[PDB]
């Protein structure tokens, strides 16, 4: 059976997907997606705020029943837990000066100076595809210096998470004359297969319910209406 009340864990420090408003209500695209799915599942859902690092432990311990918290669908996590179908993409993407012909390809990037955050999934992607193939990829301790190096012309391009740069640098005055260069880069190995509802492996009925609700709210246009509140692009991806 479904939970009487599905307890859904999230970390409310990640706008525009999950945060708290002035009245202490949970808000964001993750919250809209969860609530809409729950409505169609005809189950009660209670949101539970905690730190992201505690979510999978809480799920395994049955303190909560589901995770919606921009949780990447990784093969490593798939070994321990289950996921719904993709909620939206969490891919990376290059940023360069407006008008730049740069593409996220080895051919385009040879001769270029690319910056990436040290220790990141973006760094790993850039390492295997670009740096070891001869592209000047330089790793940074701090994202802020990546962006100030880009605007100063020290860097030609920066490889970042797509949505975070879209909400951050590209909407700040310093990023006004900058733009994504080429399409997002997609690879489950480095970036996962999108985000999804995190679930216990044996709760197959609950997975079936979330997946059914998601398919239905996507095909009747509710997904796109909800996403448009936060995003002016195809956040779902491919």
CA atoms of 134 and 76, how far apart (whole Å): 29
Closest CA to 10 of 68, 53, 54: 68
CA atoms of 224 and 188, how far apart (whole Å): 24
Structure-token pair, residue 72:
């990447």
CATH classification (class only), 91-191: alpha beta
CA atoms of 68 and 85, how far apart (whole Å): 12
Helix ranges, 162-203 (H): 162-167, 188-191
Q: How was this structure determined?
A: X-ray
Record the resolution, in angstroms.
1.7
CA atoms of 150 and 130, how far apart (whole Å): 18
Query: Do 156 and 75 meet the contact criterion of CB atoms below 8 Å apart?
Result: no
What phi and psi, each to the nearest 5 degrees, are found at residue 164? Answer: -65, -40
Q: Which CATH number fits domain 1-90+192-238: 3.20.20.80, 3.40.190.10, 1.10.10.60, 3.90.380.10?
A: 3.40.190.10
User: Are β-strands 136-140 and 113-117 bridged in parallel, bridged antiparallel, or unpaired?
Assistant: parallel
CA angle 109, 73, 178 (to 5 degrees): 35
Residue with tokens 């012909």: 101
Give residue 8's region: left, alpha or beta (phi > 0; psi -120 to 50): beta
Chain centroid offset of residue 41 CA: 24
| DSSP calls for 20-84 | E-TTS-EESHHHHHHHHHHHHHT-EEEEEE--HHHHHHHHHTTS-SEE-SS-B--HHHHTT-EEP
Give how far Cα 17 sits from Cα of 12, 69, 71, 236, Å: 8, 8, 11, 13
- What b-and-e string marks burial along 179-200, b requiring 16 or more CB atoms within 10 Å of the CB? ebbbebbbeeebbbbbbbbbbb
Q: In the chain, which residues fall in CATH 3.40.190.10?
A: 1-90+192-238, 91-191
């Amino acid at each position: 059976a479904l939970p009487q009340t599905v307890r859904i864990g999230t970390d409310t420090t990640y706008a525009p997907f999950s945060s708290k408003d002035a009245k202490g209500e949970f808000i964001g695209f993750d919250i809209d997606l969860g609530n809409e799915m729950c409505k169609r599942m005809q189950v009660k859902c209670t949101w539970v705020a905690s730190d992201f690092d505690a979510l999978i432990p809480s799920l395994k311990a049955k303190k909560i029943d589901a995770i919606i918290a921009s949780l990447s669908i990784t093969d490593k996590r798939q070994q321990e837990i289950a996921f719904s179908d993709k909620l939206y993409a969490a891919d990376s993407r290059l940023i360069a000066a407006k008008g730049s012909p740069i593409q996220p390809t080895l051919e385009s990037l040879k001769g270029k100076h690319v910056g990436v955050l040290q220790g990141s999934t973006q760094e790993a992607y850039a390492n295997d595809n670009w740096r070891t193939k001869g592209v000047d990829v330089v790793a940074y301790a701090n994202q802020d210096l990546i962006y100030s190096d880009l605007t100063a012309g020290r860097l030609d391009a920066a490889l970042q998470d797509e949505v975070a740069a879209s909400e951050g640098f590209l909407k700040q005055p310093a990023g006004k004359e900058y733009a994504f260069a080429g399409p997002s880069v997609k690879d489950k190995k480095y970036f996962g297969d999108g985000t999804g509802v995190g679930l216990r492996k044996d709760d197959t009925e609950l997975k079936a319910a979330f997946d059914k609700a998601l398919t239905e709210l996507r095909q009747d246009g509710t997904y796109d209406k909800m996403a448009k509140k936060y995003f002016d692009f195809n956040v779902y991806g491919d």
